């Protein structure tokens, strides 16, 4: 889902978990009750650690991403942070959707749509992701359980296929695609296959 304002995001997540890993519902901490301006990440952590309830939260203007926002939330003896993302039209969101393929994967699909004995074309075309802008895709591949570092290359965010060449027959390769949001971060979670040409 997407939100027209930070408040819309907040109120939605008072009733629907902000986390994919635990059930975390936002509640006000015990000034504005939840927007704390350019509060440093470390100070936010200290403040939230002194709250009684899991889900105690604030939103802050990020220092590392100027002009953008972060959501900080108490859960047990930890504080979790969520980067507030923007789409092409300024709407805010935290998590990418897609009603097909593998749940919680971005892109949601990764198929080998064509292959020769030494090459292949991977495709994530069937991902329903026009609402989720990608900066660039990063593709990595290498011998499964290999010694060497993986090979990597990138393609523009408009792409929905990628060529991998020079593969040796009978060798298992692990292929992973990361969908960039900007020039630093990818959307969770990447999609990955193992394939033997």
């Amino acid at each position: 889902v997407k939100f027209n304002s930070l408040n819309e995001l907040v109120d939605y997540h008072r009733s629907t978990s902000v986390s994919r890993n635990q059930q975390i519902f936002l509640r006000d901490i015990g000034g504005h009750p939840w927007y704390k301006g350019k509060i440093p990440r470390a100070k936010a952590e200290e403040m939230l650690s002194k709250q009684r309830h899991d889900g105690a939260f604030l939103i802050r203007e990020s220092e590392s991403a100027p002009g953008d926002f972060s959501l900080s939330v108490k859960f047990g003896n930890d504080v979790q942070h969520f980067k507030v993302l923007r789409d092409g039209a300024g709407k805010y969101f935290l998590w990418v959707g897609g009603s097909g393929g593998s749940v919680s994967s971005v892109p949601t699909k990764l198929e080998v749509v064509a292959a020769t004995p030494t090459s292949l074309l991977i495709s994530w075309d069937a991902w329903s992701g026009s609402d989720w802008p990608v900066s660039y895709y990063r593709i990595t591949y290498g011998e499964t359980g290999g010694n060497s570092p993986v090979q990597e290359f990138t393609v523009p965010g408009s792409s929905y296929t990628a060529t991998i060449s020079g593969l040796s027959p009978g060798v298992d390769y692990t292929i992973t695609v990361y969908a960039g949001y900007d020039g630093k971060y990818y959307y969770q979670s990447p999609i990955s296959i193992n394939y033997r040409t």
Binding site: H81, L85, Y185, Y186, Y187, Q188, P190
Partner: peptide, 8 residues
């Protein structure tokens, strides 16, 4: 660093 994004 954040729960919903990873570092490239």
């Amino acid at each position: 660093v954040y729960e919903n994004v990873g570092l490239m």
